């Protein structure tokens, strides 16, 4: 296939797994879940469902920071995810647990002016790869984020660090003030 008659076309694919060591990578696996690998040793795991793993409304951020049993990179990514919400204005929707260094965060969801809009909009950015933009409404009720080890977690898409390097600019550019002094 000589397009200009003397130039032949050739495709190319980039194997992003070589970036495992330094950057964190992202796969989709199934449509419901979306997975993140922070190296080959630990990695976050984002799910949507109708069940609920956290049954209490308290989260205990400050206690978890005081104990410091968690892993720094994972908590950094959860921070980038949560601060990247457009209009988080419902602390009750958030809930989490940090028992013994674990990460276990959860978001409740539920005309369209709710936190479901914001969390879903940042979720689409978190793991990447034809209705309107506003009020994408997933049928599932609760979003869960957890920590997991590394296995095969790339079925729909190959690893892609696009999303994580993408929303770093969006990490704090849409936030409502919660106190007169931030």
């Amino acid at each position: 296939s000589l397009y200009k008659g003397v130039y032949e076309l050739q495709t190319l694919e980039l194997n992003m797994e070589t970036l495992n060591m330094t950057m964190p990578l992202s796969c989709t696996k199934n449509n419901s879940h979306h997975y993140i690998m922070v190296g080959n040793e630990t990695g976050l795991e984002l799910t949507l469902t109708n069940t609920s793993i956290i049954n209490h409304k308290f989260c205990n951020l400050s206690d978890a920071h005081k104990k410091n049993l968690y892993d720094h990179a994972l908590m950094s990514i959860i921070s980038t995810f949560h601060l990247s919400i457009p209009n988080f204005n419902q602390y009750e929707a958030m809930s989490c647990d940090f028992n013994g260094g674990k990460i276990s965060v959860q978001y409740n969801l539920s005309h369209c002016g709710t936190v479901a809009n914001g969390v879903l909009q940042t979720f689409m950015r978190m793991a990447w790869g034809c209705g309107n933009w506003d009020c994408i409404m997933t049928s599932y009720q609760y979003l869960i984020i957890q920590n997991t080890t590394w296995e095969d977690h790339c079925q729909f898409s190959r690893p892609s660090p696009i999303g994580y390097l993408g929303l770093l600019s969006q990490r704090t550019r849409d936030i409502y003030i919660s106190r007169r002094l931030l």
Binding site: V6, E13, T18, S76, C130, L165
Partner: protein
């Protein structure tokens, strides 16, 4: 800010390419990256060069850290490129997946082109016909310099 990372021509080996042999590009292709704020191959070229520097010139910690790329994300790439491709994703337009690429190659001398990232849509890879105008005008612009 704008991307400032240098490219220490540059060849991509078997590791960063899936199912391919060692590949090389001419000096003009890498030189074109330094003065263009829209390309996608330049971004991954800088990411892979930087990554190689990260392994060879920085020992692995016992607990590896993500802070290193946080403070130096826009030095390698235009994050607005990611935002713009997100806009093409949202607006039903074909967007860039950053995964599959395409590049023209000359038969006799192997005078290649800077690859332009493939535009995907509808969760599927486009037909050749849809961007046939784009590859045709790229070929015209490439034969222009001769």
């Amino acid at each position: 800010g704008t991307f400032t990372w240098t490219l220490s021509g540059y060849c991509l080996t078997r590791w960063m390419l899936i199912e391919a042999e060692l590949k090389c590009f001419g000096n003009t292709a890498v030189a074109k990256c330094n003065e263009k704020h829209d390309e996608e191959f330049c971004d991954m070229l800088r990411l892979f060069d930087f990554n190689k520097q990260a392994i060879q010139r920085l020992k692995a910690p016992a607990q590896m850290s993500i802070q290193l790329i946080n403070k130096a994300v826009n030095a390698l790439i235009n994050d607005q490129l990611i935002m713009k491709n997100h806009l093409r994703d949202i607006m039903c337009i074909p967007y860039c997946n950053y995964s599959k690429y395409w590049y023209l190659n000359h038969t006799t001398t192997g005078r290649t082109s800077l690859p332009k990232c493939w535009l995907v849509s509808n969760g599927s890879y486009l037909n050749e016909t849809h961007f046939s105008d784009d590859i045709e005008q790229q070929a015209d612009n490439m034969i222009t310099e001769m």
